[PDB]
Every structure is written in C-alpha cells, then in structure tokens.
C-alpha cells in the first residue's frame, strides 16, 4: 500500500476514503514509521521483498523489480547517478494496473511511487555520482551526446 | 653471352617508358604522381610499358585491346587499381571484371586508388622482373619470381602495436 503522511492520518479507514487519498485500504493493518527510519531504506527492503516474491512469468515485474531494488540499493549507498530517480518514476508508471500479469507488481511500486512523491529529497541526497555507464576504450573517440 | 645478356636485362630495366592509359580515379591519381612533390621521374608504337589504371567497361575493352596490340615486344603491363585487377567494387553488368580478362598482366597493385609511391613499387618491381628473366638476342621465358606475399611475410606479422585513431 501506499504510504500517507500525517496530514493524512484524519481520515476514515473506508476503502474510499483510503482510496482517494492515493492509497488502498488494504487489509487495515497499518505500520507506523517514525523519524529516524531512512525512507530509501524502508523503499529498499519493501522492493527487496517484492522482487524476491515475483513468480517470474511476466517480465516488468521479474525484470523491472530488480533494477529498482539495485538502484535503491545504490542510492543507499551513495552510489546514485543522475536519471535513478526518474527511472524509479517510470518504473512506477510502466509496472501499473494491466501491464503486468497479475496485481503483485502494482502493489509493489505502490510504497515506492509514494515515498518518492512524500519523501524525494532522501532519494534526491542518495545521488553523489556522475552518471557512467561505458570506459573509455584506447583508440575509439566516444560519441559525446549533449 | 652471361654478361651481354644481363647487359641487355639492364639496359631494359633502366630505360622504360609508359604509355599511361588510365581510365578513371585512378589515372587522376596517376596524373598527380607525375608531380614535383611525387618524384616519379607519348605513343603505344614506341611506348614498352602499358600501364592500365582504372575500370575496364565493356565499351572501353576494344580501345584498351587495339592499344596493346599496337605496342611491340617487348611489352609488359602494370594493372592499378582493384577495377583493373578484378573489376573492383562494380561487379555489374556494364564492366569487364579485371583487365587480365583480354591482355597478360605482369604487375598487380592492389589499392582504389593506390597512391603514386604503390606505383613507384610496382615499377621496382616490374625492374626485378624483367632483370631476372631472359629473352632471346635476336631473331619468352619469364622467370617465376618470389611473391611479394610470402616474402613480406616476417616483417608483417613481427608487427605488434599501431599508433592509434584517436590522434594525428
Ligand atoms: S506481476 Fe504477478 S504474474 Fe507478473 S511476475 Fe510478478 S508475481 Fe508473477
Ligand atoms: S580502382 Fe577505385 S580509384 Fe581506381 S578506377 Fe576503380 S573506382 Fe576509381
């Protein structure tokens, strides 16, 4: 599920009301997180769990779950590049309701989507690293893209 | 006799004049060989050298034919060029697929275009040619040189490292 801030916490626990806040009701068990838990850390276990309890039959969840785990993994770290964030924010939109199998995936980025919305200065602090994805190879001049 | 034919091979290989019958690209490059900054230093009756440099179409054969049959003996050919070894890169229905098709050729030199220092080889080599066989004084067996291939083989593959794209 997807998590709410305290402005949030004044609020019925009805599916709709739950439902228009940008969350679900769920199963109406909810957990408390206090000041001193790191978001990006929380985010990291949750996709942790996620991407270990994939089935494997449709791709963006059993392709797509690890490499949100492994980016917030490097944003914890301090290892981040610049494009995570928005690679985690397409995952989000691209993992939805309907493209993948079944409901595992959705509810996966969920808590991702919205700590990303509630909480983004953490995983803005987790980027310390330029973005590098090649080396340098002796003798081939590299395509400097702008 | 030993030394007045090698006398007569060396007055031969000294002395050779061509008849630069070039067709394309290849006889640009030929015409720029004859510069100042190259230092490479007529007509087909008096002409012993015919240097054919540059595609040999189907229209452009009888001309390159009646041109050789014009010289006199003796008579060798360099081919310039991959359109006048093979037909090149026009493997097409309008060009004659090597000049070697219709006249002997005694000299290949790869390349499109080669540059004129390629030339300069071939002429050396044309020179060796011509001084290890023999011909008779008065009124043909080609010596079977060593390829250029086999013989260059050491120095080419000794070759390890390569200055690099990146730079100048
Ligand atoms: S979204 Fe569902 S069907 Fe697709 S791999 Fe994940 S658990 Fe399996
Ligand atoms: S070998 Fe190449 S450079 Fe020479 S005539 Fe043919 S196309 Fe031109």
Not at chain 1, 5 to 25: C, N, Q, V
Not at chain 1, 37 to 44: A, D, E, G, Q, W
Not at chain 1, 122 to 137: C, D, M, R, V, Y
Not at chain 2, 52 to 65: N, S, W, Y
């Amino acid at each position: 599920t997807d998590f709410l801030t305290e402005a949030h916490l004044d609020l019925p626990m009805e599916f709709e009301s739950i439902g228009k806040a940008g969350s679900r009701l769920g199963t109406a068990l909810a957990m408390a997180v206090d000041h001193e838990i790191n978001m990006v850390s929380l985010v990291r276990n949750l996709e942790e769990f996620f991407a270990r309890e994939s089935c494997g039959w449709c791709t963006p969840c059993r392709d797509g779950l690890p490499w949100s785990v492994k980016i917030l993994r490097a944003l914890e770290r301090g290892e981040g590049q610049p494009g995570d964030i928005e690679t985690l924010e397409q995952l989000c939109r691209f993992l939805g309701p309907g493209k993948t199998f079944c409901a595992h995936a959705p509810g996966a980025v969920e808590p991702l989507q919205s700590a990303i919305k509630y909480f983004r200065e953490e995983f803005e602090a987790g980027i310390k690293q330029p973005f590098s994805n090649t080396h340098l190879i002796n003798g081939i001049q590299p395509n400097l893209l702008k | 006799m030993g030394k007045l034919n090698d006398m007569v091979n060396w007055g031969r290989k000294n002395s050779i004049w061509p008849y630069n019958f070039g067709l394309s690209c290849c006889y640009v490059e030929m015409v720029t060989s004859f510069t100042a900054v190259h230092d490479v230093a007529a007509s087909p009756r008096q002409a012993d050298l015919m240097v054919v440099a540059g595609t040999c179409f189907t229209k452009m054969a009888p001309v390159i034919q009646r041109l050789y049959d014009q010289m006199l003996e003796p008579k060798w050919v360099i081919s310039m060029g991959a359109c006048a070894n093979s037909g090149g890169m026009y493997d097409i229905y309008s060009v004659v697929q090597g000049v070697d098709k219709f006249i002997p050729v005694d000299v290949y030199i790869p390349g499109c275009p080669p540059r004129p220092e390629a030339y300069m080889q071939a002429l050396m080599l044309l020179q060796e040619s011509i001084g290890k066989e023999r011909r008779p004084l008065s009124w043909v067996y080609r010596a079977n040189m060593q390829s250029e291939r086999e013989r260059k083989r050491g120095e080419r593959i000794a070759v390890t490292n390569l200055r690099t794209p990146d730079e100048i």
